[PDB]
């Protein structure tokens, strides 16, 4: 289909994830630090984001936010083993305390400069506070 029928907001953060995974696959399988270590450090994070549970689908904007957190590099410091707990806790907090932000993305259909400004502060503050 060529992504002819897809929301504008999702394209911005998925077109860039395609390249990350395509470049991760071609190198990171061998049965330096400038390029290679960073590449698989990002790829191992990106793989863990795609796992999901059972009998629990998600709305579009929450997926947009959770992918937006990963793609920009806000999670390149945490150990990969603890990513799922961060996903769950951050989703619950965002759903509860920021119900007005999601409606903006749903109604507009695309991101904006003000929305992009808000999300960085929210992500950095919650990352700082969430260390348990």
């Amino acid at each position: 289909v060529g992504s002819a029928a897809q929301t504008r907001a999702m394209k911005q953060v998925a077109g860039t994830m395609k390249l990350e995974l395509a470049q991760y696959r071609e190198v990171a399988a061998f049965a330096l630090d400038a390029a290679t270590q960073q590449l698989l450090s990002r790829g191992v994070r990106l793989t863990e984001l795609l796992k999901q549970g059972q009998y629990a689908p998600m709305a579009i904007e929450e997926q947009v936010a959770v992918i937006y957190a990963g793609v920009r590099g806000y999670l390149d410091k945490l150990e990969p083993s603890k990513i799922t707990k961060f996903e769950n806790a951050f989703l619950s907090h965002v759903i509860s305390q920021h119900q007005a932000l999601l409606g903006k993305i749903r109604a507009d259909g695309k991101i904006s400069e003000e929305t992009d400004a808000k999300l960085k502060e929210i992500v950095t503050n919650f990352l700082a506070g969430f260390e348990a």
Partner: peptide, 23 residues
């Protein structure tokens, strides 16, 4: 092969920039 030829492009680009800046 992917790693070995990913390594050389940085040197080639750096030398291109230095050459073009010099002249």
């Amino acid at each position: 092969e992917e790693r070995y030829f990913r390594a050389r492009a940085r040197e080639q680009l750096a030398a291109l920039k230095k050459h073009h800046e010099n002249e």
